[PDB]
């Protein structure tokens, strides 16, 4: 198994300057003739020419139209093509080729596929070798003229990258498209669709050139009706570029297309973006609410990418969180300026914290520039997006908007049209710290630790005050665990956004102010500071790190309750409630551990409680803010702070604290959710797909999240509170109202009449089945034979097989049932999974990459089936490398 090293990168022997391709599409093979204009590079030192090439049937290749003999001249093993020194010409030579293909059975969804009755393809990383021969890698640039020719019935929309430069009959009932993309591209870029296509499209003028760019969105025929918010979603990505980076479209067209079968969210392809469906296509009655910011993240995520991936492109797969890292950022940006909620930033938080650092602290901890690879199906990581995008952000927050604006502008300038590395925009990112610095000596050399250097960083605090000297101190120390990647860890450049708190009146004490950290410990000391503050710490999260406030409960409840920030309000809120499961944690552990026949329980601290109650009842307080703060942190980010970590005694904590809480607040609940849903609810623009209201959906998230809560507790009355909200118009409304009936005798009830309302929009069932997955259910296991029985079948869809699984997995109480049989089965799904799509059999190894965090009967019980999977004499590389990884083989 060969392993890649980033220290081991070297620029090819060889050029390729211009592809020209013709994808003949028949009904049981494609058929794949390419043209490779090629040249010498000055790296050659006459090696063989060996290209990628994955699958492919050899027709014939040729090198200046002399035919290539097998054996003799060339060999081919499946993987690469070999042809020996002697026969490689020493300047410029035209190689061909042609080779068969068969997208209909090429059901990893990775180079040429069909899904459904579209043909598509899937590129990134390395998928082009899978289509023809290449030299696959994103360093070779090359100019591409391709044609596509098909059945007209079947194939009457024909599309690649570039500008469509011929359209021609052909006989027998086929016909041609010709597309020429004279800019240079990796070929991870090249896209191709074939298919009965129907679109909605716009005329976008851009802000400086005034270019018309044409926009196009395109679907299969049945699902028309739900590509206007993507279309709407386009045109907000285009102006936010141009408003907030001076950033114009350079093409006149720009098509995004959705497909049933997709590996991942969607794809950047230039000019050609394609989309999972159930992240380009919503409509109002077919569709969740988390459908809307859904789309609106991934249609900015593909566009931002013109610029911080395709217009500038990576050296190498080692530098991948330069463009994803960057473009999470600016899409991250993008969908806190269009939503205008604080929930936005929170939820990407929310997600940082629990699923990326449990990555983190897991055997598979890697730092967002790893230095090695063997899978790149394997390398698109929540450590490589999401720790990348936060460490993009930290330049902006280091420079401040003027500053970073000025240095992103450097980068885009210096690199545009050619590819780069992570120490480019590091490069950039420093000159405009030279300039705001006003320092020619001022650098970010420490930095670049931030792309080398796993771990998540633990920031710690102590605090002084004297109050004659009016003087207050703040001590930091840091601290990153040694992993296997590195054995002594540095300390990183951390930027520490914060703000002092009047206790007495709520008030601002010190201007916008983050302290620079650089060294393993420091104090900041603030004059003129009248009275003791509380402070404010890492405002709008402004490090990727562990902190520990060293705050007393009282001192978070009056942040939660007063402080401007809705980062460090919503942190305060998650620390008072860790303390307090870790608390609880430890007596019911005990209890078990000691087989007590009494013991008692620490309740819930009872300001906290009517510091939620007061934010609850404050009519100018923000809705999803609220759904935050009744909602206990997510088990993934609780395990990280316990070891052996016994999922029932999780479970039974986190019951007895949200009881605890409920027994106080049911009836400002049940107020609340009956007050909340005129506005909530509101139909007035349902039948209008360019009406969305971030607001509102956050507010039918409170009712929804309060709607739970009481229905666990069996508030007196509520189911008649859930049979109507199973009639409302709204799936968010009618889909909770089937999980939350859980509890109740008229859940099969609810789950026949929302299947009846989904079964004829293949999207929605999906989320039918997330939500019966995810059903706080006694009977899951039989529910889940139920749902492979009589819906999800053989289906070798992506988001059919994880919408089945995935949820059920975070049933803490159920999936990690003793008897090791929730593990049993998803194993069972991993390696059935395996046989047709590695990558996707990968994504369901999830709930596995804590297994060395739980208790050491349920670890044992995890290991056993990653043993058992890595057994399979049929395993994939993907799957086989993920899990020698993760079980420290
Ligand atoms: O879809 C996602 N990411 C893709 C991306 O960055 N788009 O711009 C993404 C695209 C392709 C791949 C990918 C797909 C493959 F089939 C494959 F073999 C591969 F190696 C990588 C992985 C992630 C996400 C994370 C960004 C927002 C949507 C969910
Ligand atoms: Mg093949
Ligand atoms: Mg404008
Ligand atoms: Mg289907
Ligand atoms: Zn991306």
Not at 289 to 295: G, L, T, V
Not at 311 to 317: A, G, I, K, Q, Y
């Amino acid at each position: 198994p060969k392993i890649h090293y980033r220290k081991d990168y070297k620029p090819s022997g060889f050029i390729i300057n211009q592809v020209t391709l013709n994808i003949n599409i028949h009904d049981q093979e494609t058929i794949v003739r390419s043209v490779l204009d090629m040249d010498i590079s000055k790296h050659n030192v006459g090696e063989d020419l060996v290209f990628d090439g994955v699958g492919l049937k050899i027709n014939e290749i040729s090198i200046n139209n002399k035919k290539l003999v097998e054996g003799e001249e060339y060999t081919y093993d499946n993987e690469f093509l070999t042809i020996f020194s002697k026969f490689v010409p020493k300047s410029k030579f035209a190689f061909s080729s042609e080779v068969i293909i068969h997208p209909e059975t090429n059901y990893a969804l990775t180079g040429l596929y069909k899904s459904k009755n579209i043909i598509v393809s899937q590129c990134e990383a390395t998928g082009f070798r899978r289509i023809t021969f290449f030299i696959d890698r994103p360093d070779m640039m090359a100019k591409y003229d391709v044609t596509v020719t098909a059945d007209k019935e079947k194939y009457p929309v024909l599309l690649s990258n570039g500008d469509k430069v011929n359209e021609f009959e052909i006989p027998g009932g086929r016909h041609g498209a010709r597309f020429n993309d004279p800019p240079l591209k990796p070929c991870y870029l090249f896209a191709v669709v074939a298919g009965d296509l129907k679109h909605l499209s716009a005329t976008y003028i851009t802000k400086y050139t005034k270019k018309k760019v044409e926009l196009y969105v395109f679907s299969e025929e049945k699902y028309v009706s739900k590509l206007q918010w993507a279309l709407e979603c386009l045109k907000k990505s285009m102006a936010f570029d141009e408003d907030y980076f001076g950033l114009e479209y350079d093409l006149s067209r720009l098509n995004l297309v959705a497909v049933s079968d997709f590996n991942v969210g969607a794809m950047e392809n230039k000019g050609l973006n394609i989309f999972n469906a159930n992240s380009l296509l919503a409509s109002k009655k077919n569709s969740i609410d988390f459908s809307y910011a859904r789309i609106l993240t991934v249609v900015g995520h593909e566009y931002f990418h013109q610029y911080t991936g395709n217009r500038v492109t990576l050296r190498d797969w080692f530098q991948l969180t330069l463009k994803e890292g960057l473009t999470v950022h600016r899409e991250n940006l993008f969908s806190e300026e269009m939503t205008k909620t604080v929930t936005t930033r929170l939820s990407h938080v929310d997600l940082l914290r629990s699923v990326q650092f449990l990555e983190d602290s897991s055997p598979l901890s890697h730092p967002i520039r790893p230095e090695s690879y063997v899978s790149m199906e394997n390398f698109y990581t929540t450590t490589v997006y999401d720790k990348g995008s936060e460490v993009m952000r930290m330049y902006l927050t280091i420079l401040g908007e003027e500053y970073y604006k000025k240095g992103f502008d450097i980068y885009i300038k210096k690199n545009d049209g050619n590819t780069a590395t992570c120490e480019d925009f590091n490069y950039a990112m420093e000159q405009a710290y030279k300039m705001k610095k006003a320092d020619n000596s001022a650098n970010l050399n420490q930095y670049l630790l931030w792309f080398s250097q796993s771990g998540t960083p633990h920031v710690s605090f102590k605090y002084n005050y004297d109050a004659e000297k009016k003087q207050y101190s703040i001590h930091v120390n840091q601290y990153t665990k040694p992993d296997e990647n590195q054995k002594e860890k540095k300390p990183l450049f951390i930027p520490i956004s914060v703000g002092l708190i009047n206790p007495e009146n709520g008030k601002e004490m010190i201007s916008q102010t983050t302290l620079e950290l650089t060294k393993e410990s420091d104090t900041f000391v603030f004059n003129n500071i009248a009275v003791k503050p509380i402070p404010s710490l890492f405002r709008g999260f402004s490090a990727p790190v562990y902190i520990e406030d060293q705050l007393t409960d009282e001192e978070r409840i009056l942040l939660l309750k007063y402080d401007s920030d809705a980062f460090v309000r919503y942190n305060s809120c998650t620390n008072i409630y860790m303390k307090q499961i870790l608390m609880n944690y430890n007596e019911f552990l005990k209890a078990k551990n000691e087989k007590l026949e009494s013991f008692q329980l620490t309740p819930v601290n009872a300001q906290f409680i009517d510091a939620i109650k007061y934010l609850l009842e404050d009519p100018h307080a923000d809705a999803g803010f609220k759904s935050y703060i009744v909602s206990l942190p997510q088990d993934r980010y609780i395990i990280n702070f316990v070891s052996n970590l016994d999922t029932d005694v999780l479970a039974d904590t986190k019951e007895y604290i949200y009881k605890q809480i409920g027994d106080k607040l049911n009836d400002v609940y049940y107020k609340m959710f009956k007050s909340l849903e005129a506005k909530a609810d509101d139909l007035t623009y349902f039948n209008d797909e360019s009406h969305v209201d971030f607001d509102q959906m956050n507010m039918r998230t409170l009712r929804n999240t309060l709607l739970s809560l009481l229905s666990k507790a069996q508030y007196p009355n509520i189911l008649n509170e859930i049979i109507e909200h199973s009639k409302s118009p709204y799936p968010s409304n009618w889909l909770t109202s089937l999980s939350v009936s859980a509890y109740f005798d008229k859940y099969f009830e609810l789950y026949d009449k929302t299947y009846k309302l989904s079964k004829d929009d293949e999207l929605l069932l999906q989320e039918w089945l997330k939500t019966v997955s995810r059903s706080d259910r006694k009977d899951i296991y039989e529910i889940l034979k139920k749902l492979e029985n009589e819906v999800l079948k053989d289906s070798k869809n992506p988001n059919d097989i994880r919408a089945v699984y995935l949820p059920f997995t975070n049933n803490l109480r159920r999936f990690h049932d003793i008897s090791g049989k929730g593990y049993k089965l998803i194993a069972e799904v991993i390696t059935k999974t395996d046989k047709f799509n590695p990558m996707v059999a990968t994504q369901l190894c999830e709930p596995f990459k804590l297994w060395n965090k739980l208790d050491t009967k349920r670890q044992e019980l995890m290991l056993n089936e990653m043993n058992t999977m890595l057994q399979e004499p049929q395993i994939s590389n993907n799957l086989k490398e993920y899990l020698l990884r993760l079980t420290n083989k």
